[PDB]
Amino acid sequence: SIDETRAHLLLKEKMMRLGGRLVLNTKEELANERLMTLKIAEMKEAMRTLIFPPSMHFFQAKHLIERSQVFNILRMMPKGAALHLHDIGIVTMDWLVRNVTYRPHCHICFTPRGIMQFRFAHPTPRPSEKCSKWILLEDYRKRVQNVTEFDDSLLRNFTLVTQHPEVIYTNQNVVWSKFETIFFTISGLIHYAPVFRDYVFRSMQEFYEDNVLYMEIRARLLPVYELSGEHHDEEWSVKTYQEVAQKFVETHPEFIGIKIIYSDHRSKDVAVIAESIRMAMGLRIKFPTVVAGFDLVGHEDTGHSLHDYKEALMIPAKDGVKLPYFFHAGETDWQGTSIDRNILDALMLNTTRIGHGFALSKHPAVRTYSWKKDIPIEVCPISNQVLKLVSDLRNHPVATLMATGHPMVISSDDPAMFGAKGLSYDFYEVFMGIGGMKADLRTLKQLAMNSIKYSTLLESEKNTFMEIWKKRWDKFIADVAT
Amino acid sequence: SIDETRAHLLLKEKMMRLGGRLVLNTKEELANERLMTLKIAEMKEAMRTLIFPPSMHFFQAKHLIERSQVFNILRMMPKGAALHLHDIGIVTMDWLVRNVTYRPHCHICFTPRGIMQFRFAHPTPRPSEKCSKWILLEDYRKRVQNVTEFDDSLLRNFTLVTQHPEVIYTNQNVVWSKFETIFFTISGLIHYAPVFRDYVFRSMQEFYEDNVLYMEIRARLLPVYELSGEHHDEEWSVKTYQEVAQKFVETHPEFIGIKIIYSDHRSKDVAVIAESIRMAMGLRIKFPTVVAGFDLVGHEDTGHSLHDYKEALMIPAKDGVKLPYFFHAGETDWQGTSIDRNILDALMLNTTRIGHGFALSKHPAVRTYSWKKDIPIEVCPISNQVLKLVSDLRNHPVATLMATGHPMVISSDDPAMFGAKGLSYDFYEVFMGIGGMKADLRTLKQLAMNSIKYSTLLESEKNTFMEIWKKRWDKFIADVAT
Ligand SMILES: OC[C@H]1O[C@@H](n2cnc3c2N=CNC[C@H]3O)[C@H](O)[C@@H]1O
Numbered sequence: 001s002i003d004e005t006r007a008h009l010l011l012k013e014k015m016m017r018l019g020g021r022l023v024l025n026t027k028e029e030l031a032n033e034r035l036m037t038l039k040i041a042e043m044k045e046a047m048r049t050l051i052f053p054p055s056m057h058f059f060q061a062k063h064l065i066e067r068s069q070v071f072n073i074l075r076m077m078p079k080g081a082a083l084h085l086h087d088i089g090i091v092t093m094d095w096l097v098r099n100v101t102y103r104p105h106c107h108i109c110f111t112p113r114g115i116m117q118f119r120f121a122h123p124t125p126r127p128s129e130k131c132s133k134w135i136l137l138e139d140y141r142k143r144v145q146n147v148t149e150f151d152d153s154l155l156r157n158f159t160l161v162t163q164h165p166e167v168i169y170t171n172q173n174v175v176w177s178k179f180e181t182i183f184f185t186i187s188g189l190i191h192y193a194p195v196f197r198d199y200v201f202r203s204m205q206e207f208y209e210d211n212v213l214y215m216e217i218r219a220r221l222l223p224v225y226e227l228s229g230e231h232h233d234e235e236w237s238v239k240t241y242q243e244v245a246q247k248f249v250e251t252h253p254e255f256i257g258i259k260i261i262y263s264d265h266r267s268k269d270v271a272v273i274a275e276s277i278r279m280a281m282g283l284r285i286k287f288p289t290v291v292a293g294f295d296l297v298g299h300e301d302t303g304h305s306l307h308d309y310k311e312a313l314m315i316p317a318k319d320g321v322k323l324p325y326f327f328h329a330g331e332t333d334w335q336g337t338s339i340d341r342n343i344l345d346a347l348m349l350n351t352t353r354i355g356h357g358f359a360l361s362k363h364p365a366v367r368t369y370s371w372k373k374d375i376p377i378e379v380c381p382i383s384n385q386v387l388k389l390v391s392d393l394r395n396h397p398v399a400t401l402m403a404t405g406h407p408m409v410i411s412s413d414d415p416a417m418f419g420a421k422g423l424s425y426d427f428y429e430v431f432m433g434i435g436g437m438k439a440d441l442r443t444l445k446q447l448a449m450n451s452i453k454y455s456t457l458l459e460s461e462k463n464t465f466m467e468i469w470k471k472r473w474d475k476f477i478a479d480v481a482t
Numbered sequence: 483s484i485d486e487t488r489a490h491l492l493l494k495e496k497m498m499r500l501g502g503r504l505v506l507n508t509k510e511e512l513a514n515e516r517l518m519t520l521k522i523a524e525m526k527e528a529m530r531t532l533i534f535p536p537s538m539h540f541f542q543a544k545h546l547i548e549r550s551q552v553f554n555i556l557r558m559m560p561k562g563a564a565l566h567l568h569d570i571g572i573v574t575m576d577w578l579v580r581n582v583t584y585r586p587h588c589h590i591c592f593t594p595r596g597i598m599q600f601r602f603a604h605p606t607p608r609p610s611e612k613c614s615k616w617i618l619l620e621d622y623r624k625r626v627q628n629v630t631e632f633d634d635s636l637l638r639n640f641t642l643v644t645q646h647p648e649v650i651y652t653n654q655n656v657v658w659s660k661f662e663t664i665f666f667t668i669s670g671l672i673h674y675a676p677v678f679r680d681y682v683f684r685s686m687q688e689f690y691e692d693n694v695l696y697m698e699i700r701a702r703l704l705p706v707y708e709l710s711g712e713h714h715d716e717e718w719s720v721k722t723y724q725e726v727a728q729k730f731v732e733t734h735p736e737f738i739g740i741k742i743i744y745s746d747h748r749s750k751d752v753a754v755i756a757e758s759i760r761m762a763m764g765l766r767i768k769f770p771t772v773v774a775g776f777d778l779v780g781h782e783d784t785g786h787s788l789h790d791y792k793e794a795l796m797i798p799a800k801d802g803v804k805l806p807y808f809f810h811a812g813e814t815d816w817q818g819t820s821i822d823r824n825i826l827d828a829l830m831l832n833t834t835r836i837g838h839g840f841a842l843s844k845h846p847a848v849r850t851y852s853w854k855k856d857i858p859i860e861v862c863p864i865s866n867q868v869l870k871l872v873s874d875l876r877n878h879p880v881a882t883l884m885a886t887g888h889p890m891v892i893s894s895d896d897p898a899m900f901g902a903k904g905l906s907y908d909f910y911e912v913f914m915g916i917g918g919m920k921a922d923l924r925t926l927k928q929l930a931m932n933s934i935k936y937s938t939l940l941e942s943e944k945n946t947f948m949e950i951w952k953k954r955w956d957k958f959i960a961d962v963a964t
Pocket residue numbers: 086087088089180183218219220265297298299300328331383413414
């Protein structure tokens with residue numbers, strides 16, 4: 001009888017965790033059995049040695065994750081869609097250094113402060129008040145003893161990856177300082193028109209290679225520029241995203257495409273943000289098929305709150321227009337402050353999705369409300385660790401949310417900055433670290449399907465996506481089963 | 483109307499968090515207002531500088547906590563009872579070195595391995611297997627150049643406190659290794675009969691000084707010894723605890739006293755543990771007023787599970803006897819393993835309280851069940867940090883439990899080993915770190931009263947305790963209000 005109470009409690013928890021009610025077919029049961037065997041063995045060994053990758057910093061754990069049979073299987077998995085990504089954090093930096101810096105007319109410089117910076121131009125730009133002298137890379141590489149070392153020093157400046165990140169990044173402000181500095185540095189490389197096209201195209205290649213078929217991207221839409229010095233506008237960038245995605249889908253008929261969530265920094269004046277809201281509405285009218293809506297990005301702890309921006313964020317409503325929102329919210333360790341209430345305010349503004357929602361489990365009422373309105377959180381485990389919200393991903397607050405089957409999708413955020421690629425590394429962390437030992441094939445399947453369900457595609461486009469994904473899923477099942 | 487939805491969600495969260503429905507009188511409202519002003523200002527500053535003690539390792543944060551006006555107020559607070567403590571971790575080590583090592587007949591030694599160890603004996607005991615030569619301390623202390631350097635090196639071996647604990651304690655096994663070695667070292671000092679009495683008495687002094695009025699102690703009841711070499715038994719230790727506590731209450735009429743929870747190590751054979759269960763039953767019969775029940779202690783990750791011990795733990799039930807249990811359970815970062823299911827099995831064995839219950843929020847069904855049976859968790863924040871379950875106490879899983887007003891008590895576990903004293907440091911961590919910015923005087927008051935409610939005292943003794951505590955509370959309120 002007490003045995004029955006015990007078994008009942010275990011079955012209840014089996015049922016309410018994420019994906020726990022999905023019915024598996026006998027083929028899937030077989031794949032799950034082989035998957036779980038590999039998982040359990042790996043966890044037993046980590047319990048013995050205490051070498052457990054999700055509990056270590058991703059920089060040090062990455063090489064271990066790459067040796068994992070579980071990771072290997074997750075690489076193969078059709079993961080659905082990547083829903084939380086940033087314009088310039090989605091392509092391995094290797095290609096930026098080895099390919100892009102070797103292209104004609106690439107110039108390098110250093111600010112009065114010593115911050116690296118790039119520009120494609122002809123001829124050499126005029127010394128300005130942010131760059132005492134510009135220097136062509138082809139000249140610079142001739143004057144250096146070890147070229148391969150100079151190149152590696154560029155790669156080390158383009159990511160956060162380092163040994164001893166605990167010593168390098170002493171606090172959250174230091175890490176955010178370096179983070180943003182990287183965006184600034186690589187900016188001049190990516191926003192040169194023919195690199196921009198190649199960049200967009202390559203990010204689709206990398207995610208397609210990771211078995212991800214759809215992408216929604218938070219994009220600042222900064223001006224793209226030509227060798228002449230001409231600057232393009234927001235319209236032109238959205239047109240280009242559409243065009244490159246069409247070109248990609250033409251040679252990869254299973255890839256669904258990309259949509260754009262227009263974004264601006266939360267460190268700006270409400271008046272500037274009001275200007276950005278109008279742009280977003282204009283972009284929606286002009287490109288209703290490409291532009292999903294709007295978001296505010298940047299260091300959440302130090303910038304303005306959603307409340308601070310109420311006047312600007314209500315503009316669409318006052319014009320009787322619906323501008324969908326996809327707010328970053330509650331990406332913080334603070335509890336009961338103006339920052340974690342951003343989740344509440346995102347919900348009050350009818351957000352379609354919540355970015356991160358890290359502080360959600362500390363607010364039971366908001367949690368219930370979001371679950372009731374079926375508004376998912378976009379969880380990005382590697383980002384949260386690297387940006388120092390949580391050391392050991394076993395302690396990630398989303399573990400509680402998975403345990404009650406909360407609506408959520410997994411994404412990678414800025415994989416390239418963390419030394420990750422695509423979506424598989426983040427699926428590893430969720431499946432091995434956050435979900436615990438009982439997270440199974442159902443958890444994975446549910447998370448894959450969620451990413452199609454909570455995308456901004458039309459319902460008929462969702463069906464077509466489901467159709468394509470189901471077939472890739474069966475193929476995956478059959479492989480793992482043998 | 484959306485404003486109303488927003489205000490409703492905030493009020494709901496205000497109401498369901500721990501203590502949220504306690505009605506404050508106007509005096510308490512005034513104390514709360516002055517308390518919250520000091521708390522908010524301190525948090526504002528920590529948000530500015532990122533110097534926030536609960537987010538730092540306690541070893542480095544302690545000196546900052548001691549400069550805090552909030553800590554100061556919490557020192558003054560009548561906290562009720564300390565319900566989760568261990569026999570030999572409750573007295574500042576300063577007194578062990580400065581006072582106890584200076585007492586006649588103290589001998590020091592080093593195991594083949596170099597582990598320090600102590601023994602009071604007259605005459606000097608014969609070299610045995612584990613010690614090739616006992617040396618009197620009074621000799622040793624003359625045969626050194628700097629004696630207060632030698633003394634400090636003893637204090638440094640008696641606690642875990644260190645600079646750079648991240649480097650010293652690389653993993654959880656290393657920290658547990660050092661932890662247990664400390665217990666082994668100081669053991670010979672504390673179990674000499676007249677030190678034992680003095681030790682017990684002093685731990686009451688230190689908790690009484692911290693404005694704590696009752697203690698329940700997990701005690702191994704290891705043999706206490708005399709200068710002759712005679713050993714006493716378990717009965718004798720329980721008699722002594724009772725006697726010293728009576729002596730203490732005689733000169734401190736407001737102190738309620740102590741009870742003993744008998745304990746044994748979870749690294750032992752089920753047959754040995756079966757023997758220990760019978761001892762506990764015997765001790766309950768002999769001392770129904772002193773011995774509250776039984777518990778299993780030690781490193782939970784590496785020892786046997788509660789299930790492993792089923793045969794032995796069911797002995798009382800098979801004899802038709804009720805041996806109350808107070809299990810340590812789910813003191814782990816693992817999820818879905820045999821270790822965190824110990825919470826489930828503690829509940830199935832009718833545990834009166836759960837020690838730590840760290841993994842509770844990852845098991846929604848067990849959470850609901852324990853809430854329904856009104857079974858509290860004993861949360862020890864500093865311990866969980868030092869023993870490396872969690873880096874930043876803002877990420878403590880109990881934050882979620884506080885937000886829904888889960889039944890819990892706060893204790894300090896082994897304050898002396900962490901460089902803490904009494905209960906105030908742990909109340910600081912809960913109130914500032916785990917509880918978030920909206921934790922107020924109601925939270926504190928609820929936690930104080932909970933510790934009387936969930937003690938093992940008789941209901942009429944609880945009333946008397948409440949009476950005494952209420953008077954100390956009013957005095958505290960009047961002070962803080964001015
Ligand atoms: O478009 C690049 C911009 O996106 C922003 N951005 C890039 N990655 C994240 C970002 N914003 C907030 N939180 C962390 C993570 O989700 C960042 O401010 C950068 O300047």
